[PDB]
Amino acid sequence: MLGNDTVEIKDGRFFIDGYDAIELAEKFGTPLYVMSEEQIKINYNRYIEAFKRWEEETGKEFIVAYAYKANANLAITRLLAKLGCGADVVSGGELYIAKLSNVPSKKIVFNGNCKTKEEIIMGIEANIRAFNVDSISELILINETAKELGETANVAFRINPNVNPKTHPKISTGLKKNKFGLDVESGIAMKAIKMALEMEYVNVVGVHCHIGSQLTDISPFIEETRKVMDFVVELKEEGIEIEDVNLGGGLGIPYYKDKQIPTQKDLADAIINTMLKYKDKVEMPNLILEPGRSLVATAGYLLGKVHHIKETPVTKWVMIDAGMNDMMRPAMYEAYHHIINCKVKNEKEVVSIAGGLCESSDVFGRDRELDKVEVGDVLAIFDVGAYGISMANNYNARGRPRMVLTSKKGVFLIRERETYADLIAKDIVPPHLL
């Protein structure tokens, strides 16, 4: 139950925000994503409560730029906008959704290693807080585009800080070998920022860093914060001031329910106490974080009805109508999600749970102890609010599923499912093939 603050078992049945899950499966059909509006408010409020100390002590702003890549469903993004949340967008599509969700432009940052001219025009016209520049090539394109529109673009720089490889080898290897960011150690990040200060159509406003995802140790974050701030000091020695420090996202969520993991409070104690060590060398900046998974993952549950039970010599398989095309995490990363029967039974058994796609990897969990499974039961797969519907697809010609939002106001359909007609709605047969 760790992290799933709004669900419960009442009278032998599973509930989400007070709504009977099996009844939700019955009214809306399966497979079905259920997103808890209150759980999202709780996750968001944990960040605000944990980090308000930043504004209290420095007088600067603290901004949560929700990472849209985790779930950009329009109702979810409008909910987050209404809570006062910002947006971390990585494409023109996400920027479009953020603006249609009414997220204030000064709370929008644009990340990405292949920003196109059209996307840059869009960000400049929307006057986003900043493009987090990934390369010198991007900086040049932004300054040239800003010049064409007769405007000045705000630019922050995504840097790859000099993380201690002895203490954090995996983080370090990622920063050096992946496609993102401006290497600090080799001098690239300083070269890019000095180039931008000589350009006439960009305005230098910050540095950004994002080190990884599903990190359940506070250590990598402390090291990221130290090395990012060390670079802010290096910039200050060159006479360069930084208005914003954006430390990215990556806080892990409790997929496994048996062990405690670091919370937003732990993250803030770590970040804030580290950044304040530098207050006599540089002015404290506005602080931005880009949580994705840690705002929405625990708010999502995927319900799948059992259509077949199959005993084999090695395992008892339970086949459900949810599948890897609906939620790709287990098939793609062999990632663990907690799974239960929505109905409490007086018998338990160990089974493996699979969807119906042709892919051997279309298995949601193996050797799981669940209350006795019968055809017609509804299973709930926990913690699918992030990289769930956002990576869903039509593999095996299956429509993407419906999604509902459970709220104190009622249960609302927030994503309609796709029909067989939708599967071919972008296909066009040429005359000689009619």
Place this chain on the structure above:
Amino acid sequence: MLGNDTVEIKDGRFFIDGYDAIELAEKFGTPLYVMSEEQIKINYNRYIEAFKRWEEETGKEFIVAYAYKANANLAITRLLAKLGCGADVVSGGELYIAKLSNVPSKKIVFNGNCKTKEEIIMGIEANIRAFNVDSISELILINETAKELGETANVAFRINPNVNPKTHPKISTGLKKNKFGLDVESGIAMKAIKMALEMEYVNVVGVHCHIGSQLTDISPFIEETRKVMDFVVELKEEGIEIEDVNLGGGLGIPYYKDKQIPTQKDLADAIINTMLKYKDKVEMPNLILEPGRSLVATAGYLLGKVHHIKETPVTKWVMIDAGMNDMMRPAMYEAYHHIINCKVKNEKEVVSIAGGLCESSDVFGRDRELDKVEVGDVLAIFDVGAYGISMANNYNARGRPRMVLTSKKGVFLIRERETYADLIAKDIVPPHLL
């Protein structure tokens, strides 16, 4: 160039079916999927040519049931139907497309480990050649559903033959621990078939087996055939005859261009020579194969325009507008696809090629030697006709790409691209979030 029979380098430029690739990219936009109609015809003809001896020597039919999971774009499936090809479908969605494509029901087989009652009603009403039964639970549902419709359903049985785990360890493991099929060793397959023989609304027509994918060694197929036929004998001894033997799909294609791999002829020799050895124990049946990848993979090319070149201490990156959401194989399986610049250059360099998504795994190839890359150049990613568009998605809020079909009749848009409005076309904002 192995496998890519219809492309060429002419006058320093890449051509697909005689159409200049950079010009296709300029006319239709990038990222762009290009499917070669002639390459599909060539691949299909190789199967028909290779297996013609089956009907010559046995008087029985050889049927190609194209695996729709590889690519079910409506123009592609209508092309295969016009060629006389059958269909291996795994969902109601694929059956739907097959029937709208005019594939005759007599050449349609339905695979899947979680067939729903709704899907079974469709296959029965369409009078498909066979449901490849995956479990006893499915058999029971098929019989009950047929009774309710007043119809008789045709059933084959997907079995897991007694493959030799000493000689084929990887193959034997999958067959035992994977979620598919009826185990032969344990007596489950025989029990399922004898059960069907007693049911009033099902008609027993064959046995099916599918061992894996991208197999570039004939050995596993010989083992598969031998063990499937051994079970056919065991059935004969029980007084049970088998009309169809379907050996699945899985022949590998040449992703790497440096080494020769088994062709359809090699597969036919192994399979037909192995099956004929049973001619004195059982009557030869119709033979069905379910190739997917080997029919369409080499006919598809993905063109991506280069927007940025990025030098870093570890590698020189070329950023293109094709991404993992357009084609997931490199990101999901770290699979290799041949990649070239569409313009021949007087100089080559080693570069890594990535899309623009904010996922570290969104990289198409590393340390590849390409003709000198410049911004604006178009790269071609080979062999994406299978598990390419069929696994495409909207991750990072990116629309799925356009796809064109190059033909002797002209170049036709067979898949329109998704606009920003399409990204949110299934999302619904609840009243209190308006």
